[PDB]
Design a protein around this ligand. Sequence first.
Ligand SMILES: [Zn+2]
Ligand SMILES: [Zn+2]
Lengths: 147, 195, 127, 91, 222, 116
Amino acid sequence: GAKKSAIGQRIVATLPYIKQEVPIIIVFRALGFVSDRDILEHIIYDFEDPEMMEMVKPSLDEAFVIQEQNVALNFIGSRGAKPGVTKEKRIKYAKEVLQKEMLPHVGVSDFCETKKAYFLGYMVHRLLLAALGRRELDDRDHYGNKR
Amino acid sequence: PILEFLEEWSMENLEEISPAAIADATKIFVNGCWVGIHKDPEQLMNTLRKLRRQMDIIVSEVSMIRDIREREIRIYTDAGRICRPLLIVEKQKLLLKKRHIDQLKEREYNNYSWQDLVASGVVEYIDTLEEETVMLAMTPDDLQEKEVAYCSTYTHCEIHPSMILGVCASIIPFPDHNQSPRNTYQSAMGKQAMG
Amino acid sequence: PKNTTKKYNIMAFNAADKVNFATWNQARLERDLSNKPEDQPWLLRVNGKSGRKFKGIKKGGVTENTSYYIFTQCPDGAFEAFPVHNWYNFTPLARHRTLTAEEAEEEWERRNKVLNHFSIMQQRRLK
Amino acid sequence: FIQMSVQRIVEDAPPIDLQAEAEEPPRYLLKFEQIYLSKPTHWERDGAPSPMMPNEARLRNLTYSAPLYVDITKTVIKEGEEQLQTQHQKT
Amino acid sequence: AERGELDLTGAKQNTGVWLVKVPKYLSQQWAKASGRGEVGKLRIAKTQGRTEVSFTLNEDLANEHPFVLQSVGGQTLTVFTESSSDKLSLEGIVVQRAECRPAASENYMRLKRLQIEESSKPVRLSQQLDKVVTTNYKPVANHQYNIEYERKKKEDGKRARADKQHVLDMLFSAFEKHQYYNLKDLVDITKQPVVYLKEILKEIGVQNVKGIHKNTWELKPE
Amino acid sequence: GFVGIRFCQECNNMLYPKEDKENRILLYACRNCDYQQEADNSCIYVNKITHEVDELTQIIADVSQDPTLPRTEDHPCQKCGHKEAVFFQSHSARAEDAMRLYYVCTAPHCGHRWTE
Ligand SMILES: [Zn+2]
Ligand SMILES: [Zn+2]
């Protein structure tokens, strides 16, 4: 924006059964990883790498208000089809979404938060690599990408 | 079974690994899901192929793609991958020998079939994602011989190039001397003939 | 000794936080407080109220992939190997701080949102 | 599809759970066991099965279909007493 | 004694142990082989080797040791004892981790075939057949309807009645549960037919057409 | 040469640059907690814009195992007098507007990489 303009690259994650876009760091905190280091550890792998470290900084600055797991679940539930009124109903809807809708293939059980976190971090990693320019953008016509 | 074998060959489950040790960086995937990491990619992909050329993982389309610079291994076991049979070239020399051709020639008397050729590990099914990791020769008669070296590390070899053509385009004779639009027009008209 | 049914576990920490370091004097368990029911996250503490609390969630793949026996030194004559009943990693939490559970639902950094603020203005509100 | 997918779909379907709504009224559970499949058969006006050859189904405007069967199992759990299994059969 | 929360877990000493990865079936052999005490023959071997101290960990019981070593990771993996008892304590830290690699060559392929013969070909695949002629089959009457009839051989829904004063006795005590009770509510508490009970319920009370819980039969206090 | 972060020693939420208005020395105080530490380096933000010669970096050594890359017996390795180097182009979205062929040795455990 005209005022700050320093965090222009915000990493945001659309989710199944959740209307508005959700900043990715809130999703990672909702998985059960509230620590900022504990999230950037899943996203960025070689810490001495300055580029990714700076490039994830906007997504970090854009969520300081949501700092606890249940607060994160409240945020992601506030975009449900019908959040209801009770805190512990929005909480349960967000847990059900992050359990069954978001990334089913990594798992659906109640003990796969770490797997879902690692995989979403890998997606943000691939997005950051496409941003910097290391890996090339994937191709839709390439027949290996079709089944 | 591939998940079990990977567990049994030092692939550290993603939950056990020290999370900073992910710069070991061979991020093994199965059907598109994280299953762990691995420190030795080269001695792992020489073991999944050695298995797929006899029997533990179905000799049919279980692809193994090691993307070297990206540092990933991608094992796909699912429906919808167009595979292709290609010979094997180990040390600039085919795995097919006259013994195989002689056994296949006497097909009706033997019980030697294509399946015995695939079990013998001389022909394997390469899908497309594995195709971007292999160096092919079109004809063994050349491209496996010596000159100013184009490629000294081939990995496979086409059975016969005329197998890139489909059914209705294998009818047209000398299809390399014609223009390509005319070849498509023949693939069209050849479906409208009487017989 | 196999007849004994004490079930061993795994208490694992990230290399990020500092390990017990023996500065942990005496407190190392609570498994039930996460009611909101037989299997629920542990919630651990540190020699009372003052300390760094943390929680451990279990491991998805522990036994189906490959069983991890625990071969022990066993200073006696014999050795013993125990099948691990479950694995669960510990993450430092209970916030060791104040958390903004309402935040008046602020604007998401569209406003100036002068940083190093909203948390020094807070902790001044409420004394 | 017919050898490893239909049985997968059928055995990976949740047991139909029923409890009488109208002193712990009776509860009924049903689970689907193996799938059995037969030869493409026909049923004439008189109800007799007769193997349906493909050429006949092309001539007589028929569908080359095979009857599908599945073993279901009841469970009468009632009044805190013993259950009655009663596996029906190929159905 | 109370053990609402142990939160002591015992010794600060933490005499170290070593995590090991153990095969899926070889460990099953060492376990279900006997109740010797998960020791079998387990003692520190004394050998020079390649500057390594091997183990007399049971290798004969296959009916260093072929494992290989790995370093520390994360915390070094403290391990406690969730016992059948309420709770006792914690144990030492893990000093190292050891793999479960098979001892030799292709033998692993035979081991997987053994997992398949054991594991007993675990897949349920559909089967073929001649034909089925025992589907919908000829009953005089379906048995569920038969037992419905045999039960209606007990009474009649067009029941008798003699006690007009009886009705209020139960509704005295039970209106705290439902201030207005449904007709289906009164009927089973009573044993009377519906039209006669309704003829009485006209005289005694009124139906709560618009009620917070539902719409049914309230009472005039007197 | 900014240290991309220096996580808090207490709450692990990414220390940020703050000014010490009293003594006027650079600090890195957290926000969610109250921890504050002094700063060794005084660069808080370093975007270059263009790029450096970083393709001699970001080229892992394991690429010598690729059967799809060229092998040249000329241009031998400098670290060790071994022949047979594998060579490729940048392979980056930023092409550098150049066809610089980066080499990499193919003798195991050498891993030397150089542009010429
Ligand atoms: Zn802190
Ligand atoms: Zn060299």
